[PDB]
Amino acid sequence: IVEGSDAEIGMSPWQVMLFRKSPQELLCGASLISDRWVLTAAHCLLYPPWDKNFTENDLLVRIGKHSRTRYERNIEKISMLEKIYIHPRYNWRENLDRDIALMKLKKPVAFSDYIHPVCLPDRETAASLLQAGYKGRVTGWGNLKEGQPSVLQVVNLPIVERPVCKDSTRIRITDNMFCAGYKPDEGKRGDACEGDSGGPFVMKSPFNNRWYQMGIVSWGEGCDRDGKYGFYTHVFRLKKWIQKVIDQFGE
Amino acid sequence: DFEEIPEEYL
Amino acid sequence: CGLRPLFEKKSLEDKTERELLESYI
Ligand SMILES: *[C@@](O)(c1nc2ccccc2s1)[C@H](CCCNC(=N)N)NC(=O)[C@@H]1CCCN1C(=O)[C@H](N)Cc1ccccc1
Ligand code: NA
Numbered sequence: 439i440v441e442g443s444d445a446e447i448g449m450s451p452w453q454v455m456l457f458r459k460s461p462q463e464l465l466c467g468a469s470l471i472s473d474r475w476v477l478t479a480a481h482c483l484l485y486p487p488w489d490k491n492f493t494e495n496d497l498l499v500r501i502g503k504h505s506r507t508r509y510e511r512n513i514e515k516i517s518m519l520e521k522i523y524i525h526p527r528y529n530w531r532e533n534l535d536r537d538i539a540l541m542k543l544k545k546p547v548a549f550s551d552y553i554h555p556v557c558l559p560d561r562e563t564a565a566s567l568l569q570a571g572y573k574g575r576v577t578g579w580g581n582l583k584e585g586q587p588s589v590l591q592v593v594n595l596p597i598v599e600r601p602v603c604k605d606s607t608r609i610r611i612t613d614n615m616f617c618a619g620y621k622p623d624e625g626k627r628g629d630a631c632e633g634d635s636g637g638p639f640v641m642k643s644p645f646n647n648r649w650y651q652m653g654i655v656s657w658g659e660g661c662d663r664d665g666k667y668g669f670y671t672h673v674f675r676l677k678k679w680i681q682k683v684i685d686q687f688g689e
Numbered sequence: 690d691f692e693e694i695p696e697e698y699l
Numbered sequence: 700c701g702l703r704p705l706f707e708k709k710s711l712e713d714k715t716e717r718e719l720l721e722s723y724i
């Protein structure tokens with residue numbers, strides 16, 4: 439995160455850390471959606487240009503974390519994956535279209551003051567909130583500048599209109615993506631940045647005041663550049679896919 | 690600079 | 700889902716959630 443602040447404790451209890459056993463190191467962010475299911479960016483697992491192809495055995499999922507680096511002895515819970523599921527039509531060859539994946543935990547995690555799932559949007563929730571101008575919140579332990587924070591960082595950013603999104607870049611933008619950030623005029627800064635990938639873009643419903651995950655940190659060019667925006671996986675558009683695997687494989 | 694984790698985990 | 704133990708649950712608000720809510724016209 440760029441230009442964000444330290445999270446308060448228990449502010450984002452669905453925040454997960456994707457963790458490499460060896461070298462043990464931070465892979466990406468992720469989110470807890472139930473006691474056995476984690477949502478991440480498919481590019482955190484599979485990205486051939488960079489020679490990335492993780493298997494279950496390669497990873498650890500860390501939940502209830504605050505510190506980037508320490509093992510939080512009576513707070514965090516570490517889990518093993520039972521299974522990874524990537525969007526069959528994820529496009530790693532051109533634009534990261536459908537950048538989403540689900541991870542099934544070996545054993546269900548117990549909820550706590552620090553560990554609690556986020557909701558998945560519904561058509562009407564998506565309808566009223568996914569609006570240009572409306573702000574969302576991003577969290578992660580990624581790069582501070584286009585180095586690494588000691589504690590979880592948070593930033594609030596406004597949703598931007600499709601055309602502006604589209605005119606900011608040469609990559610082909612699809613309906614499975616939205617972009618967020620301030621306009622250079624606007625004069626407020628903030629962005630996600632490398633290492634933030636796979637983390638949640640959440641909004642708080644003013645109707646039932648629950649936290650909903652609208653997006654997943656996906657890609658950008660640079661971090662906090664003026665005239666540029668972060669891109670996120672549009673979670674609602676991909677809901678059915680999600681519905682499908684949970685319903686065909688777990689819970 | 691990652692502090693070490695419980696071998697029960699790996 | 701989405702109701703945080705240390706916040707919604709005790710009816711406490713985080714330091715910047717209002718910036719969110721105020722943007723929802
Ligand atoms: C995110 O943190 C990561 N994913 C990986 C996975 C494995 C190794 C390391 C990391 S970093 C990062 C988030 C960027 C957010 N930026 C802004 N909001 N400003 N994502 C990436 O770096 C992705 C993954 C591959 C290429 N990425 C890019 O963002 C490229 N800069 C742009 C790009 C987009 C689409 C196709 C190819 C390149
Ligand atoms: Na363009």
Ligand code: NA
Nearest residue numbers: 662663666667
């Ligand atoms: Na920017």
